[PDB]
Write a protein that binds this ligand. Structure first.
Ligand SMILES: Nc1nc2c(ncn2[C@@H]2O[C@H](COP(=O)(O)OP(=O)(O)OP(=O)(O)O)[C@@H](O)[C@H]2O)c(=O)[nH]1
Ligand SMILES: COc1cc2c(c(OC)c1OC)-c1ccc(OC)c(=O)cc1[C@@H](NC(C)=O)CC2
Ligand SMILES: Nc1nc2c(ncn2[C@@H]2O[C@H](COP(=O)(O)OP(=O)(O)O)[C@@H](O)[C@H]2O)c(=O)[nH]1
Ligand SMILES: [Ca+2]
Ligand SMILES: [Mg+2]
Ligand SMILES: [Mg+2]
Lengths: 54, 334, 437, 428
């Protein structure tokens, strides 16, 4: 019902209509998690090349 | 070939519906968790409405209206009738009712009870049935779960020979297009032991539930009076038909209840579609006035009428959406 | 005047970026070569459009935009396309091989090798900013780059640009519009890692956009060109307040204020009307009452769900065209009576309205017709959790048998991260549950 | 990722391999000399994938031709498209493998394997970004079976992060060279289980039956059987060779088709099925294409897909047709037969349309199925193996090249493990 906060200009206008009232990881931690994933990829490739050496 | 799923095994009505669907040869059943269905015969608790209508190249339909629990819970029905202007506090076909929480409208309940206490008129209320306000309130808190206190109908209609009590069950099908279909056949779930105006402690004559009764089966088989006999009784005893005296009010209440919740539950423009069968429960007093007791989301049919209703469900709710290779319902126009 | 940097990650992000920046140029009068004859201050200025465009001494208006893909194909079409002179080469970053629909490959393997280069080229755009407010991130939930690399970027932007706001435009996966089987995995994984790092996120279900294209434009099999030009129109509505003179949503912090009370629940539903076919000769032009009413139809929503079964936390109506406040309020009053709009008890029942007199600009030869008035509604409804539930169910189905998991594990990611991500989603669905009933 | 390096090992490998290059050279508008003479620009937009741009702007297939016998490779060189292959890429020994896996993998093959890998390395260095490798070979002989699986192993060592893709012809008594084919197959399957990402199981039994029952040819040759293979090979690689909606490579195909690393053996299919020269004139409707490609009479592996369940499906429709009708038909087969597709992988059937049709057909469909029914193929080979092995029959051919009985038992074991692993997913 109530039309508050009305602001006008050439481009357009804006307003608010109330109808009823109411009742982080670090840089060090990112480098750590990514490199732990590189180690698991390294280990799995090392296990593969060991198996292929067998 | 259309495909369906069954997710309510305990549903006696829809077990017969699936049985009839398979028998045509144009419907195949899939496993509970197969998402590639045309029809869902869903579960009572926590139905996954959010998963419907998202499977490409399939028209999807379910046997439940999402939101229709607002009509089918005792607490919800009172809240809906009191707030919705279509019904209004002044509703005349619904008994005076109040919502009480155990540890809310407790002050509103006792304000009306005092007017009844000062005037000294009929002051009996149902929740166990008692005449004392403070004796019932102590028993609600004793239970645990939230229940409703309602004005008890102290002047019911008598059935002769017997001086008995009864409630009327009517089966209502709302289709995918929001057509309201009342099944022409209803049932009178009767009391066998005569009504006692003084002793409220006895519950077998006051409560007309099919479980409590099972003098069971004295006057008619399984405490069930069908529409032809009850019409015949009203003609002989009270000089009136069931159509005029009772059924017009029944047709009014069903229509008024479902028109109220149409904008909230309707699946007219949705990605999925819904139909639902309802059980409306009515009480007729001595002046032939009809009162709404409860609405049933998952209703059970009577033994004589299973075959006809379930076939009718397939006709206007299922085959209307999924066609194959006299009408038993009265349409309530709006 | 505060500046906004747009980041486009993966195929979906880049291709939507093309569509938006095309539309932005047509709206601001900017040509394909970057010249803007209406701009009088040559070589600089602190106008409203300078939030999205920087200026050179030559008179060229250049998007504050960085395009990143792990594979060259799609950005190569930007490099050689009709807007080749608009962006300078340093803004268009490509790798050699893509993330193969694998979150873990995009996040951990190829991600690590390109993260520093991207942030360096981002830093080059931030250096030209007199006062940076933050970032708009365009990506898909489905793609390996779009899910994997994006979540890593969002993590790093929280470190390097700690104060700044971040907004998402995310593409939700749909089987109807060329998806892969593993996209439910990629979605859950990226949402979890990004949840902390995004202030406001606008989900766009590919299913919803596909059907709007079918129903309203009469296009039988919609191409990406069709879908993106539609998506861009919606995106343009959302960002219009940052590019034009106004008092509503003037900066990125105001998007949180007006739409996001609960920080985790930061997924507003976008609803848009009217979508009208260009191939429709004779069209009955729709009124303010009719287009505001279309905001509460599920057939017009960017995500197919039912707002009637749920609660509102916020609501914004953004009008473009011939609209006056009187007609808005009159429409709201009628809609309030006939429809189920339920707000949460701890929030005011209300609408923040923004009107821009300039009607929506249509792409010449596009599928959308010119309209006299159009609206975009941004509503934070608990109903959008339906899309989480659908996706979580698909995740649960595959993960029960550990299907495809080995592809993720084979890129250095732990099996534990799957269930860790899924638990967060079970937390998220519950947050919506407590607020919603 | 764009460039694929092709290898063809042995008699079968080179024969189906030569036919593949013949078929796809036609599709890209390349003559036997290597010069482009086509009309559409789309024929050249993704020609990088299989061809190296040569001097004078001529195109040379990225193919390496391998055999322990000069015979079959001499036929290729003096064949219809023989002049197109880089002469340095012809790598041959002299003694042959005598239908012996052990000769291919351990003795004769070991001598020649390094010579091959030098050419593989030289083609790899020319690659802008190497996508992966494809091998055409049989599993029943010696060279393709023994040396092929040796080559795969050695390539996996040098290029451990690259896709290995194989077209592997399965042996059958219906089309048989020697009694030792089940021995050679069982030894090779062990290797393919561990060292390939995608294997297209081309069963000779199935190819015979298609020629006999469907194509109505009374006595089919190897030429008849290979026509079906080259058509299927062209079909499966359509999205790699031609521009479309699909921005996809071999790795993406491996990710989505293989839910579990060992179960990567696919049932290929084709519609419509046709014989050489004489082909049907009546146009196939989209409903007929879909109905045929899913039918077991069109499958290149002799398995009944009704005995198992589909883990993942991929389909490539070729030609100018209604993509809406394609979608409607594809979803019709799924929604009618949903008891044969796994419920635990959502949306596991994927379709791609390419506008360019193959030579002699207005529209065609190619099928790739990761079905649990493929166990029946391995069970067949396993039964034939045990029939001879329980009596240690014909084993002296292998023990004479230094092989032990242990290796046979281990190979039989890994195959019975594979079969029971397929059985694991057919019920719950
Ligand atoms: N709306 C829209 N969706 C797209 C577009 N391109 C791709 N998608 C969707 O995004 C998902 C796949 O993500 P892509 O962006 O293609 O993949 P990517 O981010 O490049 O990652 P990789 O290719 O795996 O390295 C699918 O669900 C597609 O439906 C587009 O232009 N518009
Ligand atoms: C380059 O060749 C192909 C590569 C791929 C796919 C495919 O089947 C149409 C191919 O043709 C054989 C494809 C594969 C199967 C999948 O379904 C399980 C999937 O999710 C996903 C797809 C592809 N993606 C789409 C949207 O189709 C990605 C990988
Ligand atoms: N489909 C097909 N199968 C073949 C062809 N040539 C040989 N085979 C099969 O391959 C097996 C013999 O292997 P072969 O390739 O001759 O041995 P290699 O020369 O040592 O590799 C037998 O099962 C044959 O049926 C062919 O041209 N087409
Ligand atoms: Ca300026
Ligand atoms: Mg990509
Ligand atoms: Mg031979």
């Amino acid at each position: 019902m109530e039309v508050i906060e009305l602001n006008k200009c050439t481009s357009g206008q804006s307003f608010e209509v109330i109808l009823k009232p109411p009742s982080d990881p670090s840089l060090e931690e990112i480098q750590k998690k990514l490199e732990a994933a590189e180690e698991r990829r390294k280990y799995q490739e090392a296990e593969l090349l060991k198996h292929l050496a067998e | 070939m259309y495909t369906f799923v069954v997710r309510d095994e305990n549903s006696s009505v829809y077990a017969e519906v699936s049985r009839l669907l398979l028998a045509t040869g144009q419907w195949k059943r899939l496993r509970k968790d197969n998402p590639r269905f045309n029809l869902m015969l869903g579960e009572r608790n926590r139905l996954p409405f959010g998963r419907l209508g998202h499977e490409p190249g399939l028209v999807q339909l379910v046997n439940y209206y999402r939101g229709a629990d607002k009509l089918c819970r005792k607490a919800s029905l009172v809240k809906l009738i009191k707030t919705s202007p279509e019904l209004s506090e002044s509703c005349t076909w619904f008994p005076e009712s109040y919502v009480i929480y155990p540890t809310d409208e407790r002050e509103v309940f006792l304000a009306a009870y005092n007017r009844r206490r000062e005037g000294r008129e009929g002051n009996v209320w149902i929740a166990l049935i008692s005449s004392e306000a403070s004796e019932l309130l102590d028993f609600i808190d004793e239970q645990g779960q939230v229940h409703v206190i309602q004005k008890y109908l102290e002047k019911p209609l008598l059935l002769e020979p017997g001086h008995r009590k009864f409630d009327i069950r009517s089966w209502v099908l709302v289709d995918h297009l929001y057509n309201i279909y009342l099944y022409r056949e209803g049932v009178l779930r009767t009391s066998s032991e005569p009504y006692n105006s003084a002793n409220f402690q006895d519950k077998t004559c006051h409560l007309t539930n099919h479980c409590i009764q099972k003098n069971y089966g004295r006057y008619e088989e399984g405490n069930e009076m069908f529409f032809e006999e009850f019409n015949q009784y009203l003609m002989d005893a009270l000089n009136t038909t069931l159509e005029n005296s009772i059924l017009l009010q029944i047709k009014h209440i069903i229509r008024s209840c479902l028109m109220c919740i149409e904008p909230a539950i309707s699946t007219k423009h949705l990605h999925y579609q819904s139909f639902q069968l309802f059980g409306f429960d009515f009480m007729v007093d001595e002046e032939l006035k009809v009162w709404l007791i409860e609405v049933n989301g998952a209703p059970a049919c009577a033994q004589k009428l299973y075959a006809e209703l379930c076939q009718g469900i397939v006709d206007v709710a299922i085959s209307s959406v999924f066609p194959l290779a006299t009408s038993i319902f009265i349409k309530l126009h709006h | 005047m505060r500046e906004c940097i747009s980041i486009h990650v993966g195929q979906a992000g880049v291709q939507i970026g093309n569509a938006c920046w095309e539309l932005y140029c047509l709206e601001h009068g900017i040509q394909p070569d970057g010249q803007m004859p209406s701009d009088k201050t040559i070589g600089g200025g602190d106008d409203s459009f300078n939030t999205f465009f920087s200026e050179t001494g030559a008179g060229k208006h250049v998007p504050r935009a960085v395009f990143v893909d792990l594979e060259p194909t799609v950005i190569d079409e930007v490099r050689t396309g009709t807007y080749r002179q608009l962006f300078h080469p340093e803004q268009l970053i490509t790798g050699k091989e893509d993330a193969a629909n694998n979150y873990a490959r995009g996040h951990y393997t190829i991600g690590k090798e390109i993260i520093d280069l991207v942030l360096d080229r981002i830093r080059k755009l931030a250096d030209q900013c007199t006062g940076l407010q933050g970032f708009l991130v365009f990506h898909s939930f489905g793609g390996g780059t779009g899910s994997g690399f994006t979540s890593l970027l969002m993590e790093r932007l929280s470190v390097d640009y700690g104060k700044k706001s971040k907004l998402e435009f995310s593409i939700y996966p749909a089987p109807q519009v060329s998806t892969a089987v593993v996209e439910p995995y990629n979605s859950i994984l990226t949402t979890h890692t990004t949840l902390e790092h995004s202030d406001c996120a606008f989900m766009v279900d590919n299913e919803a956009i596909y059907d709007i294209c079918r129903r309203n434009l009469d296009i039988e099999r919609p191409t990406y060109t069709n879908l993106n030009r539609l998506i861009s129109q919606i995106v343009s509505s959302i960002t219009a307040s940052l590019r034009f003179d106004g008092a509503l949503n003037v900066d990125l912090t105001e998007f949180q204020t007006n739409l996001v009370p609960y920080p985790r629940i930061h997924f507003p539903l976008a609803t848009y009307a009217p979508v009208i076919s260009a191939e429709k000769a004779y069209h009955e032009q729709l009124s303010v009452a009719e287009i505001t009413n279309a905001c509460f139809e599920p057939a017009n929503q960017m995500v197919k769900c039912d707002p009637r079964h749920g609660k509102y936390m916020a609501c914004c109506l953004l009008y473009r065209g011939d609209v006056v406040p009187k007609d808005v309020n009159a429409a709201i009053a009628t809609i309030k009576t006939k429809r189920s709009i339920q707000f949460v008890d701890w929030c005011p029942t209300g609408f923040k309205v923004g009107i821009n007199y300039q009607p929506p600009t249509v792409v010449p030869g596009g599928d959308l017709a010119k309209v006299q008035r159009a609206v975009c509604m941004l509503s934070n409804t608990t109903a959008i959790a339906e899309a989480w539930a659908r996706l979580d169910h698909k995740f649960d189905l595959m993960y029960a048998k550990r299907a495809f998991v080995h592809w993720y594990v084979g890129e250095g990611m732990e099996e534990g991260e799957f269930s860790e991500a899924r638990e967060d989603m079970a937390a998220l669905e519950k947050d919506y549950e407590e607020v919603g009933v | 990722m764009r460039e694929i390096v092709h290898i063809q090992a042995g008699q079968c490998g080179n024969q189906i391999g030569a036919k593949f290059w013949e078929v796809i050279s036609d599709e890209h508008g390349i003559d036997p000399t290597g010069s482009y003479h086509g009309d559409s620009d789309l024929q050249l937009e993704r020609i990088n994938v299989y061809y190296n741009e040569a001097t004078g702007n001529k195109y040379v297939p990225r193919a390496i031709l391998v055999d322990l016998e000069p015979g079959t490779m001499d036929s290729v060189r003096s064949g219809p498209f023989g002049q197109i292959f880089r002469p340095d890429n012809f790598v041959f020994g002299q003694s042959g493998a005598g239908n012996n896996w052990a000769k291919g993998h351990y003795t004769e093959g070991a001598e020649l394997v390094d010579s091959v890998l030098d050419v593989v390395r030289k083609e790899s260095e020319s690659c802008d970004c190497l996508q992966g490798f494809q091998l055409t070979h049989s599993l029943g002989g010696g060279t393709g079976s023994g040396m092929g699986t040796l080559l795969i192993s050695k390539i996996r060592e040098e290029y451990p992060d690259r896709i290995m893709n194989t077209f592997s012809v399965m042996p059958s008594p219906k089309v048989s060279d020697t009694v030792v084919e089940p021995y050679n197959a069982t030894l090779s399957v062990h290797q393919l289980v561990e060292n390939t990402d995608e294997t297209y199981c081309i069963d000779n039994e199935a190819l015979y039956d298609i020629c006999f029952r469907t194509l109505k040819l009374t006595t089919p040759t190897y030429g008849d059987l290979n026509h079906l293979v080259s058509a299927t090979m062209s079909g499966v690689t359509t999205c790699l060779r031609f521009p479309g909606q699909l921005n996809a490579d071999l790795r993406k195909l491996a990710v989505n088709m293989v839910p579990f690393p060992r179960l990567h053996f696919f049932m290929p299919g084709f519609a419509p099925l046709t014989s050489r020269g004489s082909q049907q004139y009546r146009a196939l409707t989209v409903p007929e294409l879909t109905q045929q490609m899913f039918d077991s009479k069109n499958m290149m592996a002799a398995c009944d897909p009704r005995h198992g369940r589909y883990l993942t499906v991929a389909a490539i429709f070729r030609g100018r047709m209604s993509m809406k009708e394609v979608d409607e038909q594809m979803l019709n087969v799924q929604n009618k037969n949903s008891s044969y597709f796994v419920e635990w992988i959502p949306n596991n059937v994927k379709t791609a349309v390419c506008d360019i049709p193959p030579r002699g057909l207005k529209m065609s469909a190619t099928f790739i199925g990761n079905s649990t029914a493929i166990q029946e193929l391995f069970k067949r080979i396993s039964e034939q193996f045990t029939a001879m092995f329980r009596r240690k029959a014909f084993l002296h051919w292998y023990t004479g090249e230094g092989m032990d009985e242990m290796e046979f038992t281990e190979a039989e074991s890994n195959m019975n493990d594979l079969v029971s692993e397929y059985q694991q997913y057919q019920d719950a």
